[PDB]
Every structure is written in C-alpha cells, then in structure tokens.
Amino acid sequence: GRVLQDVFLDWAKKYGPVVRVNVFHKTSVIVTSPESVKKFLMSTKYNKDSKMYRALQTVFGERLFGQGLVSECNYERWHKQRRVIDLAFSRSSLVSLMETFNEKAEQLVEILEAKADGQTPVSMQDMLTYTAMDILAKAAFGMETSMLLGAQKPLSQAVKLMLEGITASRNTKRKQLREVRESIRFLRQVGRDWVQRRREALKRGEEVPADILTQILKAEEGAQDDEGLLDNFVTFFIAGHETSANHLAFTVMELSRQPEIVARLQAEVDEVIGSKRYLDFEDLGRLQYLSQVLKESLRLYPPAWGTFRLLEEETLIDGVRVPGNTPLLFSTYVMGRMDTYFEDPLTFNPDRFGPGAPKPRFTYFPFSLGHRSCIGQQFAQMEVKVVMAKLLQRLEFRLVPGQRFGLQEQATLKPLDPVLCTLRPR
Template identity: 30%
Template sequence: MMNYSKSALSTIPKAKKNPFFGNTLDFVRNPLSFLEKMQKEFGEAGLVKLNLVNRDFFLVLTPEDTKHVLQENNRNYHKSEAYKVLAIFLGNGLLTSEGDFWRRQRKLAQPAFYKQRLALMVEMMNEEVMNLLKRWEQHTKNEALDMSEEMLNLTLRIVTKALFSTDVKHRLGGISESLNEIMHFADNTLKSFIRFPLHIPTPRNQRFKRAVEKVEAVIYSIIEGRREELKQDENVRYDDLLDMLIHAKDEETGETMNNQQLRDEVTTIFMAGHETTANALSWALYLLSKNTDVAQKLREEINTVLGEDGMPTFENVRELRYTLQVVQEVMRLYPPAWIMGRKALGEDQLSGHPIEANTYLILPIYLLHRNPAYWQRPNEFYPDHFLPENTKNRPTYAYIPFGGGPRMCVGNNFALMEMQIVLALLIRKMDFLLVEKNETKPDPLVTLRPKKALKMKIKTVDR
C-alpha cells in the first residue's frame, strides 16, 4: 500500500479548466489540437490532470510511462469505460474482455494469427485487390471515386474471407450498411454528453439495435452452418480463422468455445480487423498523392521486387521494405487507433507522481507519434523515419500504432501484410490523384478517419 501526502498529490500538473465544464468543451471541440496544446504545456512534466465530463483523467505523455502502463505493470490496468460502448456490440470478445477470461481467450485465438496461418492468406488478399483493379478498369476514368469507401469495402471483403473463406458471400448482402450504422452509433455515443440508455427507443437506438441483430444473425448462421458440417464429417477443415477458433482448445481443461464466445470473438475480429486497416490505407493513398517522390520510390521498389506482373508471396512481401516504411509512416502521422484509455486497479506511480486506485488514464498515441523529441520531421510524411539507423535509438513506446504489452493488437502482422500487399498491387498499376480543393483533415472518432470523403481520380501508370 502506497501512502501519499496531500501535498504530493497536489503537485500533479493540472490543465486550466472551466469552472462548469472542466476541460470537456475544449476537448470535444477539437480533440487533436487540445491534445497538442497539452503536449506543449505539460510535455516536460510527462503527465497532466484533466477534467472531462466531471471525471478526472491523467493524460500520459511519455513513452516510458506508456510502457509502464501497457507492459511493465499491465496487470494493474483495465480498459476504461469508453470500451463499454464497444462491448455493447462486441460482447466479451478479445478487445473488451479482461482478466483471466481475456487471458484464456487470447491464448486460444493467438495461433490463428501465427505466421504459417498468415501465409495462407496471401493469395486471397492478392485476389481481392486484383478484383478491385478489374472493377476499376470498367470505371469511367474522369469520375472521382471515394477512396475511403473503396478501401472500407476492400478490407471488409478481405477480413470476411479470412474469417469465413469464400462460402458465405451470399449471406453477407447488406451487412456493410449495418456495420456502418454500428460504427456511427459508437462514434456518436462517445462524442455526445447526453446518452439515452439502449432500452429507450430513440430512432438512433432503434437503428443500432436492428443493425446489431442483422450482423449477429449472419454471424450465428455461419457458426451454426459450420457446426452442422462438422456434425456430418468431423474431419472437415477450412483454412480460415473461424476454423481455428472453433477447434481451439483450452490446454488445461480441454474446453472449446461455445457459440456465444465464438460470436463475440468473430464479431470483434470482424470489426477491429477492417475499419482500422481501411483508414490506414485511405491515409496512405492521400499522402502518396501529395508526395509523388515517395510514390515514385515506392513504385520502383515494387517493380524491382515483384516485376511488372509478379504477385506478392509470403516470402517476397518481406523484401518490400520501403513499402513497409511507408505503411509505418502513414500510421505514425494518422494512427487509426489514435487514443487508448485505461483505469488503474491499484496505486501506482507515473513520472514520479502518485496514481491512486481507480484513476483513469488517457494514452494519446497521436501525440507520441508526433513528439519532436523522437521524430526528425514530426509533422511531415517522411518514411525514412523508419530506416533502421533512425529507429535504433528511439524508445519502442514512441511508436505504438498497435498498442503494446500483452494487449497489443493480435492482428498486427495480418494488418501489416495486408497493407503492404494492397499498396504494392495498387501503386504498381495506378496513380491516385486527389480531386482539387478536397484537402482533408483527420476526424478523431473511435478511429482516426479522413474528415471529408476522399475523392480521387485514378489513372493507369504510363509505362
């Protein structure tokens, strides 16, 4: 038990606040510029106390404290209340569960993301991108496309196939609208001060419930279909994530997951596994269209490694080093998961200040990624930030697009490989031209999305 005097607690730096609203209005009006202001004022202190919606939060500003929370003392922290909004839909899946239950589920799900499993996904990813290129060929060249939407559809198709193979296409009709509805609901709920409990039939609550029911019905019918097939022939196996999850067995008890647990894990992977990646890809196309020198260098690497018509393989993707640097740099500037929240279970210490039990922490990934102490050109698109000579002296927790410690994103290698493959195949063949005056800014919702529709024209590369 740590004992702190009142004076030790009072030395914790505090942001100036409004007597009625605390820091809520400033934060909600423009979260990113508010965070940047906090970084400037309190960066040296490493920690600052904020008051949001009548509750105290500590904003953690250093990689060292972030590492302490996510890794060194991770058992002292649970996810914060904001994740409860996600849990309404994701249930007790990996992203939202805690403690021993989470530990067991993570152990069961982890092998689905091992390298040999990912290797099986490469061809499927290639096929989906090639189908997209074919669809684009039929598209009138002068008409602009909304690239955020294109990338969202692409990553949704990829994660669907990764989870369920190819046999479920017909059952997924209309699901993307429902997913959209669910994401909007989560965004709005996190942003608004007044939340109507779900049992109050507001139009938004009703739409959300209908969307959840629709997605849930599809997922349950797929799970039940698989179970039925296994009843007919217990040796039926698929090369997909659902197959791994259905067969995953607890080492100690020999138990497998029931339908409810499968539903929660599948839904979590479904949601966590496509919107984030789509955002990163949209930002990549945006940044490449504005940095043609980087796009050119990227295309040279792709042509050297893959040739004019060669396809990515699990082996040659590793040679796409500059492509990886580009992906890393995109997620530095625009981390899809731009902020994370935690709650301290017991007392702790951060930047020399005492942290009491039940304290809420905000971990602003966005700020770490733009802190001038760790980045030569913090606000520029500069993939050389990720050259080995530039990364070696940087604290690991200065760059955490996938979080860190035991709760680090289970799909990180899947996502990195997917983004390399998508970019390699698209950039080899296409130039992406941003429609004029359509500059965009990041919109910090549940994930960091481009604020406006990302309208782009596409043009086949001249050879």
C-alpha cells in the same frame, strides 16, 4: 477537421507528461513520457480499464463486442481466449492467407482500372473498406461477402450505422437509436448464420482449414449459449477490417500529395515484383520502402490512437502523484506529433524508418505494445502491403479538387473526406 486527440496533443505539449482529462465524460490521466509507456504497457501487471471499454461491449443497450478479445479486461479471462486464438495467427496460418490477400487486391485493382479514365470520381475510403471487409470475411470466417462486386449492401450499411452509433453514444436522433439497434442485431445474426454454416459443413464431415472462426469456436468450448462466440465474431468482423481500411485510406490520401515518394514507391514495386500478378510471402519482406511509408502513415495517422490501463494503486508518475483507481490514457497519435519525440513532426518523412535509423523507443505504438498488443498486427501489415503493392504497380491517383486532408473520429480515426480520387493507369 480536428479531433479530441488534437486537444490532448495541445495539453500534453503545454502541461507536460502527466495530464488529467475528460474522455467519454470520464476522468483519466493522459501519460505521454516514453518511460511511462514502457512501464505500463510492457507489464502484465497493468490491465485494460473495463470502464473505458464499456462503450464497445454494449452500444445503446445492445450487446456488441461483449467480453470478446478486445473488450475483455480481466487478465485471466483474456489470457484464455488469447492463448487459443493465437494459433490462427502463426507464421504458417498467415502464409496461407496470401491467396485471399492477392485475390481481393487483384479484384480491387481490376475494378479501379475499369474506372481509370481520369474523370470518374472514386471514393477510395469506400473501396478500401470493401476490400478489407472481403479479405476479413474470407480469411477469418471462410465467407465471401463480395462487397467489391456490389453485394451485401445491407451488411455494409449495418457496419456503417453501427460505427456512427459508437460515435454518438460516447461523445454527443430518433431513427438513429432504432437503426443502430437494428444494425447491431443484424451483425450478430449474420454471425449466427456463418457459425451455423460452419457447423453444418462440419456436421456433414466436410474438411475445414484452420482459421479464426476455428479458434473462436474452440475457445467457446463448454459454454451453454454461444453469446461469447458472437461477441468474438463481431469483434473480429469489425477490428479485423476497419482499422486496416482506415490505415489504407490515410496512406492513399497522403500519397496523393507526395509525388516524389510515389515515384520511389513505384520504382520499388518494379524492382522487386515487376509486373508479376501474384505476390509471394517472401516478396513482402523486400518491399522495404513501402514498409517505411506505411510505418510513417501510422505515426501521423493511427486508426487506433491508443489504449487505456487501470492504475490500481496510487503511484508516482514523472513526479506527479496519481491516485489509485485511475484510468491511464496512452496515445500514439499524441506522441507522434510531439517535437520532443519526432523532429519536424508534421512532415510526412518515411526516411524516419529507414535502414540504420534508431527505432522509436516507446514513442510510437500503432498496434499498441505488450500483452494487449494487436493480435492482427502481422495479418494487417501483410494485407496492406499486398493491397498497396498492387495499387502502386497498376494505378495512379489524383485527389478530386475540394477534398480535404483532415481527420474524424468514429470508433477509430479515419479521413474526414471520403478520399475522392480520379484514376489513371500507370
């Protein structure tokens, strides 16, 4: 259960802060000094490398993320979508999402409580993925997928294959090619239909609370076809649930072998929310220790391990001449595991993020940094606190003997094993 990132870690440690590599069968330079991270990520002068993102824009010759918000590299084209889409992420937009967050988390916990007999194995990876998908579908596009309740099996199956498609396409077979193409076309069709269903409600003068769909449509205002829209549809559908689910899955997985931390987490949910059923916005800020545990989870287990920038002009980086036209790779996974940046890096220790501790300085970036940072950071941090808070209040988890703690790389990092647990009530 090692990943290509673990090899980059070995080389960063051994060959220093500037290392030429092969990723996606392409030359790049991995750059792992905090000073280089600041200089390149913190300036609008450096932009994403279209070359490295082509594997999201299209897969197996089927259009996927296209020139959506993640995969668009040109600053001006990106800046135009971002300025608009940003509105759906205001403090007030996010406050409004609390209900969706509580509703899905509650439904999750209820489903789990029904299986909490200590004998039924439950894939926490699958359940968390269904939750995150149901949350995203509702919060972003105003649709109920009810995957938690067994619905939309074809859609979840389509996301699954598509993800494996992204996995096979850039790294490594007859049916897979067909399945993946079909899955990508199904996803884009799903988006067609949900855009239509929104348009027809609007056509009949119905009222629509501003959301992500509202701003994606709005950014597509004046285009002859809606292919840009479906790009942004698939972008958010995927990016707005997969990393959250992976992050939750890693956190649950790790906590199963951290009883003392669970005890403090439990003690904390009690003090701040009690046995209350609904979490208020202001409740989130007070779950400070849960916050540290999630931060520490992202340090060791970042679903999105890093990012690429195009270095346009030959530049000196930490004493090494790097030629112009070179993709720079930045890895929060790598830096998180280097003892030069984090003491005893392999130890899961949430006190690293405790009150009074200096904040890691450009050595930790699970949502990236600068202008290309994650638009959904706060959205994500909120949903996962809501979900974990409810789990911690009501349930205890035990990993099914034989479950491993390792990682795998699909389109993101996620647990190698499905996180099979048996459940008991707290």
